[PDB]
């Protein structure tokens, strides 16, 4: 947590969950990292328990997240001189979307009583609506990049801990110590013994 943060783009790191200070001393198992781009003030819709267009039909967050989200603004890499209508989101749906689930099914919404067999008429519209991305828009329409990280404890054992940039260790001089996370009362003298590689 020293290269992805502390950067030039504006960091919208206003999230609830794990402590940012405790991030460097946490060992989570099987974190899911998903990235998506939104338009303007839709950052608030990505929240646990939030109700909205994205939070009900596009990306629903469950009651428990065990973590939080990271968002940043990018009006240069997601904008063009002409219109940028290459990113779409679903707007029409019959039932609520399950949390932590994706349903890639673009079909005709039967809003009215008359069904439509793949032909959009008067009571049928395509659920997918396209975002508008231009460098001349205001804050409420700028392209925002949000990445979601969820920490959890699964059946997989602890293998994500890592070095965590531990900077320590001294010469012996009868100094009490800590061996591999367990405190020690002895001394770190030299050794003439030969160890196996394992």
């Amino acid at each position: 947590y020293s290269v992805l943060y502390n950067l030039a783009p504006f960091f919208t790191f206003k999230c609830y969950g794990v402590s940012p200070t405790k991030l460097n001393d946490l060992c989570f198992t099987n974190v899911y990292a998903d990235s998506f781009v939104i338009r303007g003030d839709e950052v608030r819709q990505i929240a646990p328990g939030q109700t909205g267009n994205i939070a009900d039909y596009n990306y629903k967050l469950p009651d428990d997240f065990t973590g939080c989200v990271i968002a940043w603004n990018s009006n240069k890499l997601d904008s063009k001189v002409s219109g940028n209508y290459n990113y779409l989101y679903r707007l029409f749906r019959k039932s609520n979307l399950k949390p932590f689930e994706r349903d890639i099914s673009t079909e005709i919404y039967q809003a009215g009583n008359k069904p439509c067999n793949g032909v959009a008429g008067f009571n049928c519209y395509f659920p997918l609506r396209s975002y508008s991305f231009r460098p001349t828009y205001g804050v409420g329409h700028q392209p925002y990049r949000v990445v979601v990280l969820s920490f959890e404890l699964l059946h997989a054992p602890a293998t994500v801990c890592g070095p965590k940039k531990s900077t320590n260790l001294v010469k012996n001089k009868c100094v009490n110590f800590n061996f591999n996370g367990l405190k020690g009362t002895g001394v770190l003298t030299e050794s003439n013994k030969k160890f196996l590689p394992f």
């Epitope: 002409s82 067999n117 032909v119 959009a120 395509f126 997918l128």
Partner: antibody, heavy 132, light 113 residues
Framework: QLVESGGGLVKPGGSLRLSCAAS????????MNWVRQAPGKGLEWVSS????????????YYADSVKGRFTISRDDAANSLFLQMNSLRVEDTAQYYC???????????????????????WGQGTMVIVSS | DIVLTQSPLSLPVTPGEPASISCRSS???????????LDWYLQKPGQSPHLLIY???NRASGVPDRFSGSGSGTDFTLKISRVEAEDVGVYYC?????????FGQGTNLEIKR
């Protein structure tokens, strides 16, 4: 669709490059096709392709002669469409309209049968003549 | 194939009189659902072959209400309330059974001043 590129004198044994250019639109959610035209009565249909947002591998719709001679390609990242021609036997006039379809949803379409709704984005601005 | 002949198109039309153009069908226009998968395109010469009525007896793309379709099966025609000076263009009926479709014959509008 505003201006389509690709035009000039090409030998019958040569190759042709056709590309479409347009403005901001939901270009990845439409199954655009190619339509030719004659100076007299009676137009012609060249080829049809499907977008990759409705199907994983999309759909293919070819006739006999346009399968034997013509080829189509997509990009799925920019506002361009590719229409190559490895060989050309008889092609005097060709406008190659860059129209889309009025169907964002595709249903009950097999590899050789697919209803269409309407073409509302016809494009002009190119012309190819052989032996000119 | 599906090649067909439209109306003879040598019809003298005057303002204040409706104009009916009819094209028939070799086979039934019935696939999947029972909708009338037949179109009509207004190809005014010079810029683009636009459309006036899509599949079914409905209106779309901001077409004026003077143009309207009727009939089904091997029976189809158009009705125009009043022809104008901007309606000139060749006509064509577009059948939506399969993607290898053939084209009909069209002629520009005739107004008898």
């Amino acid at each position: 669709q505003l201006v389509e590129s690709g035009g000039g004198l090409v030998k019958p044994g040569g190759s042709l490059r056709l590309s479409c250019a347009a403005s901001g639109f939901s270009f990845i959610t439409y199954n655009m096709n190619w339509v030719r035209q004659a100076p007299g009565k009676g137009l012609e249909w060249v080829s049809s392709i499907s977008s990759n947002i409705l199907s994983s591998t999309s759909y293919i719709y070819y006739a006999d002669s346009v399968k034997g001679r013509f080829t189509i390609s997509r990009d799925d990242a920019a506002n361009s469409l590719f229409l190559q021609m490895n060989s050309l036997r008889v092609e005097d006039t060709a406008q190659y309209y860059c129209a889309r379809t009025r169907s964002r949803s595709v249903r009950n379409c097999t590899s050789a049968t697919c209803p269409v709704d309407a073409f509302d984005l016809w494009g002009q601005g190119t012309m190819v003549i052989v032996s000119s | 194939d599906i090649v067909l002949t439209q109306s003879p198109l040598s019809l003298p039309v005057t303002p204040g009189e409706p104009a009916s153009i009819s094209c028939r069908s070799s086979q039934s226009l019935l696939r999947s659902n029972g909708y009338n998968y037949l179109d009509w395109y207004l190809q005014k010469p010079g810029q683009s072959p636009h459309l006036l009525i899509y599949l079914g007896s409905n209106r779309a793309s901001g077409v004026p209400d003077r143009f309207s379709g009727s009939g089904s099966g091997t029976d189809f025609t158009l009705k125009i309330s009043r022809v104008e000076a901007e309606d000139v263009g060749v006509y064509y009926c577009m059948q939506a059974l399969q993607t290898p479709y053939t084209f009909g014959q069209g002629t520009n509008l005739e107004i008898k001043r």
